[PDB]
Amino acid sequence: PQITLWQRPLVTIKIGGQLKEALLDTGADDTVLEEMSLPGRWKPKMIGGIGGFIKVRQYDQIPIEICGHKAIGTVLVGPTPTNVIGRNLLTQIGCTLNF
Amino acid sequence: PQITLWQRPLVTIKIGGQLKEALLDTGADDTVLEEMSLPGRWKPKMIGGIGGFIKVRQYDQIPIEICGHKAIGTVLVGPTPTNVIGRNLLTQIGCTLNF
Ligand SMILES: CNc1nc2ccc(S(=O)(=O)N(CC(C)C)C[C@@H](O)[C@H](Cc3ccccc3)NC(=O)O[C@H]3CO[C@H]4OC[C@H](Cl)[C@H]43)cc2o1
Ligand SMILES: [Cl-]
Ligand SMILES: [Cl-]
Ligand SMILES: [Cl-]
């Protein structure tokens, strides 16, 4: 699809058996989601944005589906004010900026 | 151009006659630059990010070139970790997401 930027580019993702809304976010290196359970190993991480850093749990090799597109990658979970899909997963669905 | 997302989508912008690097950021409503001088009066704005809010100065109707594409609009100036070009200006240069 071609996604306009007149409005926030929100999509539905399927992850960990759950459906969530998230922002397609080219300024995010990493995908960051609000508190939720995910299976498998994790390690703590600090990530930084406008306003400073938050502590998150880093889960690797997590399957996700975005707009019918399956991908696998790292998902950071913690107290983000908004769910964002970062470049680590945007690449996998073949998402580009165009102008 | 078509810009893939395997690296940060960093482009050169020109503002007040000077070149800077900035991140094309579909997850940003607004454009926020590191401390700099701009002309005219400014209004207050609080903008919210992963780590909370920061206070910025809002300047309106500022000319800015983004990858050689001419835009004139609102620029916020304050203690951001990185220069970000948000949707207010990405729409002026005809940017979309595509996959
Ligand atoms: C109301 N108007 C307004 N304009 C905004 C502009 C930017 C921002 S923002 O807080 O920087 N942010 C909003 C998102 C997180 C919902 C834009 C987002 O792309 C920010 C842009 C950014 C880039 C580097 C450092 C700091 C910030 N991305 C971000 O926080 O990414 C996190 C998660 O992945 C990493 O990649 C960069 C930073 Cl270090 C980490 C908010 C704004 O609000
Ligand atoms: Cl990854
Ligand atoms: Cl590619
Ligand atoms: Cl504007």
Swiss-Prot record, chains A, B:
<comment type="function">
    <text>Aspartyl protease that mediates proteolytic cleavages of Gag and Gag-Pol polyproteins during or shortly after the release of the virion from the plasma membrane. Cleavages take place as an ordered, step-wise cascade to yield mature proteins. This process is called maturation. Displays maximal activity during the budding process just prior to particle release from the cell. Also cleaves Nef and Vif, probably concomitantly with viral structural proteins on maturation of virus particles. Hydrolyzes host EIF4GI and PABP1 in order to shut off the capped cellular mRNA translation.</text>
</comment>
<feature type="region of interest" description="Dimerization of protease">
    <location>
        <begin position="1"/>
        <end position="5"/>
    </location>
</feature>
<feature type="domain" description="Peptidase A2">
    <location>
        <begin position="20"/>
        <end position="89"/>
    </location>
</feature>
<feature type="region of interest" description="Dimerization of protease">
    <location>
        <begin position="88"/>
        <end position="99"/>
    </location>
</feature>
<feature type="region of interest" description="Dimerization of protease">
    <location>
        <begin position="49"/>
        <end position="55"/>
    </location>
</feature>
<feature type="active site" description="For protease activity; shared with dimeric partner">
    <location>
        <position position="25"/>
    </location>
</feature>
<protein>
    <recommendedName>
        <fullName>Protease</fullName>
    </recommendedName>
</protein>
<comment type="subunit">
    <text>Homodimer, whose active site consists of two apposed aspartic acid residues.</text>
</comment>
